[PDB]
Design a protein around this ligand. Structure first.
Ligand SMILES: Cc1nnn(C2CCNCC2)c1-c1cccc(Oc2cc(Br)ccc2Br)n1
Ligand SMILES: [Cl-]
Ligand SMILES: [Cl-]
Length: 126
């Protein structure tokens, strides 16, 4: 197919945790970023058929998006907060890798990344 399968959101053998930091990543970080005016391109996997981008998955080999992250958090997919943070990082970096400095989508990712970093500086630590 032209679209690869989307990243998994379940994996029965993988060991899982529920932690306060992961709960905060869902309730506060993800759900706030989700409502930002620039969130919509990032709310679902890139559909290369819909978007007419036969090169997207030629370039991006570790796709990630906030819809996948949301489902992973809801399904308790992660072991720890850093694992989820890594998925956000992959999503932003993919956008920079596929696009160009100054593109509208890159301006959006830059703004979202700054907001993300601001929110993860407030991760509960106690
Ligand atoms: C993520 C992501 N990373 N790159 N892209 C496009 C950006 C445009 N070029 C091809 C790659 C997306 C993406 C995902 C869903 C919808 C969507 O829609 C657009 C958004 C803008 Br802002 C501008 C134009 C479009 Br179409 N873009
Ligand atoms: Cl647990
Ligand atoms: Cl199309």
């Amino acid at each position: 197919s032209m679209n690869p399968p989307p990243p998994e959101t379940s994996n029965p053998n993988k060991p899982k945790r529920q932690t306060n930091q992961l709960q905060y990543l869902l309730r506060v970080v993800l759900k706030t970023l989700w409502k930002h005016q620039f969130a919509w391109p990032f709310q679902q996997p890139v559909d290369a058929v819909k978007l007419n981008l036969p090169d997207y998955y030629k370039i991006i080999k570790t796709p990630m998006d906030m819809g996948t992250i949301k489902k992973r958090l809801e399904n308790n997919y992660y072991w720890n907060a850093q694992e989820c943070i890594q998925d956000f990082n992959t999503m932003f970096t993919n956008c920079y890798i596929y696009n160009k400095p100054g593109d509208d989508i890159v301006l959006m990712a830059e703004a979202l990344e700054k907001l993300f970093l601001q929110k993860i500086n407030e991760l509960p630590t106690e």
